[PDB]
Write a new protein. Sequence first.
Length: 112
Amino acid sequence: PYECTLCNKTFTAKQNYVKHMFVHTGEKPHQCSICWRSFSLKDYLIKHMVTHTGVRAYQCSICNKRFTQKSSLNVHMRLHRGEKSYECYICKKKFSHKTLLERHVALHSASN
DNA sequence: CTTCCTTACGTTGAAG
DNA sequence: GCTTCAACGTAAGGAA
Ligand SMILES: [Zn+2]
Ligand SMILES: [Zn+2]
Ligand SMILES: [Zn+2]
Ligand SMILES: [Zn+2]
């Protein structure tokens, strides 16, 4: 029900509406006391502080590799699921089409 | 190729 | 019940 006069965007709650209008003001009052960069919202600065501490709190449950963020970990999860590959049950090689495995399995048949 | 690092939205749930 | 408002979640996309 909340709309931005400028960029014309609707928000569900008032919190994101109030924050969005402050970002428009360009003001950045949340400063990192290590590198002295400023940020418009505190939640942004909280994420920036990881670049100094080096903590990697977001660990994948599969390969156990840790990341600086959850967005970085979310996109990493798109790699543990991908296109399947057929497997010759003799030489254990992989193939990308069934008609390719049938032509290869038929090779093991002719010679033996 | 991945990952870092930035921003922008969202709902949930203590706490007045 | 009605307001925050912090702590998360989702995602995008150039930089490293
Ligand atoms: Zn706007
Ligand atoms: Zn800093
Ligand atoms: Zn993983
Ligand atoms: Zn084979």
